[PDB]
Amino acid sequence: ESNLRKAFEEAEKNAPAIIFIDELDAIAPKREKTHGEVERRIVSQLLTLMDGLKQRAHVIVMAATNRPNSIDPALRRFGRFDREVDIGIPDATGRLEILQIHTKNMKLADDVDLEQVANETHGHVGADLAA
Amino acid sequence: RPNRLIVDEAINEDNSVVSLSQPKMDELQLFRGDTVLLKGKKRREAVCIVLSDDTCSDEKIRMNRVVRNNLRVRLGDVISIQPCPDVKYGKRIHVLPIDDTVEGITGNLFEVYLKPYFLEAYRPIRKGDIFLVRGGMRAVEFKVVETDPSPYCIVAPDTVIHCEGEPIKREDEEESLNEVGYDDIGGCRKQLAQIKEMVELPLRHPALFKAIGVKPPRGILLYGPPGTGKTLIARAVANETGAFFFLINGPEIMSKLAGESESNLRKAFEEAEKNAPAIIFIDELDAIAPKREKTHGEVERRIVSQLLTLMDGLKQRAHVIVMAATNRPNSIDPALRRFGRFDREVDIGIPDATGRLEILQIHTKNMKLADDVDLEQVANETHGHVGADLAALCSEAALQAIRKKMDLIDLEDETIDAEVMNSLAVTMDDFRWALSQSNPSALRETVVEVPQVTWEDIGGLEDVKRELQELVQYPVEHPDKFLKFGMTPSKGVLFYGPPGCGKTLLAKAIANECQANFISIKGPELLTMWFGESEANVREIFDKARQAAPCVLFFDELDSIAKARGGNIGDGGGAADRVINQILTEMDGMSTKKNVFIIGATNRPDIIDPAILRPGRLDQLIYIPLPDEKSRVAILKANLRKSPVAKDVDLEFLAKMTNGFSGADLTEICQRACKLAIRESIESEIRRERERQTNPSAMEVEEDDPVPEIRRDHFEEAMRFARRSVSDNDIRKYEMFAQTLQQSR
Amino acid sequence: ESNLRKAFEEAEKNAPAIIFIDELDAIAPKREKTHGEVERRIVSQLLTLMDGLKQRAHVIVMAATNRPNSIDPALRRFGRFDREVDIGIPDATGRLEILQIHTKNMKLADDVDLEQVANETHGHVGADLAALCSEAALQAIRKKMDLIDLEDETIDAEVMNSLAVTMDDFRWALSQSNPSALRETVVEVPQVTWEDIGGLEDVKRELQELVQYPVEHPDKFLKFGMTPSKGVLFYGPPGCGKTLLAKAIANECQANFISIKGPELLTMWFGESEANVREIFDKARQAAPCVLFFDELDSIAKARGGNIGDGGGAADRVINQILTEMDGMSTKKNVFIIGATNRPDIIDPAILRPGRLDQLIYIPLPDEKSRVAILKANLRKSPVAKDVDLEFLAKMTNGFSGADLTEICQRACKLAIRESIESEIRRERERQTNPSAMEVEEDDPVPEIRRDHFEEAMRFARRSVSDNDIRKYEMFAQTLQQSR
Ligand SMILES: Nc1ncnc2c1ncn2[C@@H]1O[C@H](COP(=O)(O)OP(=O)(O)OP(=O)(O)O)[C@@H](O)[C@H]1O
Ligand SMILES: Nc1ncnc2c1ncn2[C@@H]1O[C@H](COP(=O)(O)OP(=O)(O)O)[C@@H](O)[C@H]1O
Ligand SMILES: Nc1ncnc2c1ncn2[C@@H]1O[C@H](COP(=O)(O)OP(=O)(O)O)[C@@H](O)[C@H]1O
């Protein structure tokens, strides 16, 4: 918990800052999945820390997760995380721009049909194309 | 004692107005424009202008918050009133704002605030007074630092106004006129009054309860959806009444390390005692006191037991009351519901259209809306939202209006200008845009309200209307003759007949007429509790129905379980039996005192088990005849309220062609005709724009949008490709079963 | 537990003493329901401490709980808790007495009907009545705040002497009230007398001989080796003095009464399946010699294979549990069991066995003079029909049930009430529409049943009872006819 507290206080000394936290479901699941006690303390501490962020400074916090269903509903009230943005799977065109970005340095020969590859690569993601 | 009056709320928004009953002010020689000096405790004095009021009693005085704080007084206090018509116009007055108002403000406060606020105002002002001016979207404070003549002076067109000087520092004896109050809540009037009196009785006269000896309530529970201002209500009540409100947060409690946690509670209880009578608010009780089966460890049970011991051991001493808040009054452990514990429970329902309108009115007070607001439209179309939703919507609309102003505010400066800010306004397009990027939070929940369906919306059934009046209005309006006869009014009425005849419309109309709350239950959710979740929900549903007394619980598609009783599956006998048991046990268990009525509706009277059909149960039965002749005409009139006009063909003629048709069929006919009219308008507009564009950018004559001009053509076409969906076999079956049940009973 | 130990070590060393335990079930739930480890240690320590203090000793133990079964059963051996005392909710007499107790110092005005309130506040507790008294006093004080010294400090306790309460304050307090018992079994002697029922004098005599007779002269019963059967069944048309009969006989016997109907049985069908009749019969057995009533007993027989095609679950479970529990009734306690049915043909003969429910009684339809007496009983009310006292119309009511007669009477009463409402409304809006030309208020002749009500009631005459049901009843009676 101290570390979390540490993070927050640093933002207080460091102007409007962005606080990004990753894999919330791994640390903030539903109470049904919670079998031990320490996780409850962690969730309560983080909720208290973030709810006390009223005014303070112009610090914005966002989180990364996979499924809002896996997230505990208590972290859905007003003043807490309310803005919701989803990132869908890109189409063939988006695959094309991703390939164009990743192939900027490469010396492609005069046989490359990026559009054809993008069409053939349905069901992939950015990491897939990078690899 | 015609010298002292008890203060209460004010209906006038001016800072120098007092409302009195006419005879009382006549006795004390008080009339319009009469300057009066008011003196109270703290050796504080003020000067005000007398105004009249009807609802204000002689002993009471309507007067607002600003002078309440100026006089350092709360509600119910007695004041010394003296007509003092010796005032003189001011000459040179130095006035300054408070320190916490000019932050990033700059500009000229004079021409924007002082100049308009003091135009033809003639406010009797006194040295040391403080007042507020509503800015473009903020609130500005101003305290006079010196006046001439002192201390009595009327603001006059000939004054030497000194606005120069540093904004004075905030006084620390009393905070300010910025925090919450009774004037900042909307949509909870009845419960607000209840809580207000239940806390005003102990918190104003503790010695009265000390001498009397009664036990004041020791715990009050509030339950409702999150973000409905429950904490706001508690804090506002505490601040207005005068106490030592000491909030405790649930989530931070178990965030501590074992025993220390509950020690905090103990410490809180300690500061509860030696701090005079005060109020304690506890939030998220379920987070700290869930159900017994929910608990898995031992720290949780120890915490719950510690809290129970602490609160039970509190027997009077300091006049301390406990306010608890929760989402739903079912997740809390039952043991904390007994006598000597939280017993008085209050619901915080979702605000209606009127509640939404008044809350939005409250939230937009500081801002400077454009002169195009249709607040009623927004309020009615934003159903399913809470106070937080409305506040967020207003904030977003203001922000977007600001954003579409960057040309004037291109980087502006680190110290913004007040004149530019006050020169802006928010239009309805901003509100619609904010609505576009908006999402309600209520969504899936029950709704309770008194509908607006009127009797004239349905043609015919005058005997049915009379019977409903007899069975609803009569018992409530004059129970005296009922008790003089001893006859017990029935509670069970059922409707049967052809579907789509607006039986639900009749239920809504009678609920509107009785001016009681309406609750609807539909067959889908009935089947939803038929499987999956058990019958337990029904229980609290009745409680909710019993909570909203007087109310009319409505059931639609009551034969759905009967349809599952005999159908293409016929395998849910146990679940159907459980449903029947639960509903019967709930309905027969209600007290005859409650002004709660039950209405059942179905179109399959032949399949309903007569187990429900019994005295002491749903026993009254009404058949709904199909629409006929003039009734259809009335229906043809009712759905013609709408908006368009079709003054080409007789409605009675169309009723003559549509003889023996269902009312829903008539509504479908009207809908199809209006669809054809919409298609005609669309194609005409498309043709006119096409002919205006084929001609190069031709704006020669604008073809005005045609007035609704539906001919016999559209009506005839609709009648052609639409017929009476109900066949005569259904009618004959209904009538034969009706006669069989008529002569079999 | 050290403090508990401390308590014990100070309990005996302080002369004869009494020890009370508050909310015992919170300390000793069932063993399986325990989840941690400290609670088991506490329970075992408590058991050891309380068992080890036998010696000579002078300390008695008090333990209070809500659910007797919720506690751990192990602490019920001899030396441990063995004697149980149930504290049920009071009755109207008890409610009135408690109200008197709480209001013994009240300077109430002589306008309150405590009896009416007590009858009105059924399903409450002593705490509820105390709260009602407190809030009534608060309302009375609130209605007269203005004159008392609210402006000054608290009253010198002499103005409050002038204060008084009203029954209207009590009604207002009752409006803002909430009972707590609600869903709770009721054990009491009913008040239905034999005057409430007409006809079936032979049936009444037979019931008397079955139930009353054994208690007065058991000497001849044991001399002849007679053990009266504990069980009877009723069959007949619905709504024909069935619950009324049980209430009347229980009242005459002046014993407690317990009822349960088919909806409850089907509630225990699924959900809380079984494990419920046991505690009900235990409650009856520990209770005073009383009567148990089983309404809609055929419901399970109606539900086992009737019209839905159920899953074959509680259909046998409930019946087997009931039979096993009643077979455990080894005389001694003089509690009787009564069952009611309307479709006895579906009942399996397992219950219809000697030792089990064996006595069978058919309930016929009322017979004119019986119908007349029933109507008179229903016609206590208030209005009186002078000219036509429902005689020739009563003659033509052949084939109707008592429920039908009650329905007709209620319809007539409500229509007369409607007539009074409309007449009074006519009078009043005529009085206000006219500029107060007339203001006299003479009582209308409504509180007297008039003949016109009789015709308008008989026009909507209801033939509720079907002769097919009667013929089915009689053919089934001949099917089980005692005369071969
Ligand atoms: N009736 C109301 N009138 C005005 N504003 C309201 C009302 N209800 C809610 N609000 C607004 O919602 C917010 C109140 O948030 P708050 O944290 O106090 O919620 P709550 O309903 O009291 O409880 P909880 O936070 O536990 O859900 C404020 O922005 C307030 O303006
Ligand atoms: N004045 C009226 N009289 C009869 N029916 C109407 C009237 N106004 C509307 N209706 C029709 O009644 C329908 C609602 O009937 P409802 O009470 O839902 O019956 P059901 O529940 O059997 O469908 C609406 O769809 C509407 O088309
Ligand atoms: N003296 C009487 N003789 C016959 N029936 C009566 C008499 N008094 C009342 N009743 C009716 O008998 C009914 C008793 O109900 P009950 O017979 O138990 O219904 P069910 O047979 O459907 O269970 C009451 O509803 C009442 O209307």
Coordinates of N, CA, C and O and ligand atoms in Angstrom, one line a residue, chain A residues 77, chain B residues 184-186 226-232 283 359 363 387-388 391, ligand 1:
Chain A
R77 N -18.8 4.0 -9.4 CA -19.6 5.1 -9.0 C -19.1 6.4 -9.7 O -18.1 6.4 -10.3
Chain B
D184 N -30.7 23.4 -1.6 CA -29.8 22.8 -2.6 C -30.2 21.4 -2.9 O -29.4 20.6 -3.4
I185 N -31.5 21.0 -2.6 CA -31.9 19.6 -2.7 C -33.2 19.6 -3.5 O -34.0 20.5 -3.3
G186 N -33.3 18.7 -4.4 CA -34.5 18.6 -5.2 C -35.0 17.2 -5.3 O -34.3 16.2 -5.4
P226 N -26.8 4.8 -5.6 CA -25.7 5.6 -5.4 C -25.8 6.9 -6.1 O -26.4 7.0 -7.2
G227 N -25.1 8.0 -5.6 CA -25.1 9.3 -6.2 C -26.5 10.0 -6.3 O -26.8 10.6 -7.3
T228 N -27.2 9.9 -5.2 CA -28.5 10.6 -5.1 C -28.5 11.6 -4.0 O -29.6 12.1 -3.6
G229 N -27.3 12.0 -3.6 CA -27.2 13.1 -2.6 C -27.6 12.8 -1.2 O -27.9 13.7 -0.4
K230 N -27.5 11.5 -0.8 CA -27.8 11.1 0.6 C -26.8 11.7 1.5 O -27.2 12.4 2.5
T231 N -25.5 11.6 1.2 CA -24.5 12.3 2.0 C -24.8 13.8 2.0 O -24.6 14.5 3.0
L232 N -25.2 14.3 0.8 CA -25.5 15.7 0.7 C -26.6 16.1 1.6 O -26.5 17.1 2.3
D283 N -21.1 5.7 6.2 CA -21.4 5.4 4.8 C -20.9 4.0 4.4 O -20.0 3.5 5.0
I359 N -34.0 20.0 -10.1 CA -32.6 19.8 -9.8 C -31.8 20.5 -10.8 O -30.8 21.1 -10.5
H363 N -29.0 23.4 -10.4 CA -27.6 23.3 -10.9 C -27.2 24.4 -11.9 O -26.0 24.7 -12.0
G387 N -29.2 12.7 -9.8 CA -28.7 14.1 -9.6 C -27.3 14.2 -10.1 O -26.9 15.2 -10.8
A388 N -26.4 13.2 -9.9 CA -25.1 13.3 -10.4 C -25.1 13.3 -11.9 O -24.3 14.0 -12.6
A391 N -25.9 16.9 -13.0 CA -24.8 17.8 -12.7 C -23.7 17.6 -13.8 O -23.2 18.5 -14.3
Ligands
LIG1 N1 -31.1 15.9 -4.9 C1 -30.0 16.5 -5.4 N2 -29.9 17.8 -5.6 C2 -28.8 18.4 -6.1 N3 -27.7 17.8 -6.4 C3 -27.7 16.5 -6.1 C4 -28.8 15.8 -5.6 N4 -28.5 14.4 -5.5 C5 -27.2 14.4 -5.9 N5 -26.7 15.6 -6.3 C6 -25.4 15.8 -6.8 O1 -24.6 14.6 -6.8 C7 -23.4 14.8 -6.0 C8 -23.5 14.2 -4.7 O2 -22.5 13.1 -4.5 P1 -22.4 12.3 -3.2 O3 -21.1 11.7 -3.1 O4 -22.8 13.2 -2.0 O5 -23.5 11.2 -3.3 P2 -24.7 10.6 -2.4 O6 -25.9 10.3 -3.2 O7 -24.9 11.5 -1.2 O8 -24.0 9.3 -1.9 P3 -22.9 8.2 -2.4 O9 -21.7 9.1 -2.8 O10 -22.6 7.3 -1.3 O11 -23.5 7.6 -3.6 C9 -23.2 16.3 -6.0 O12 -22.5 16.7 -7.2 C10 -24.6 16.8 -6.0 O13 -24.7 18.1 -6.6

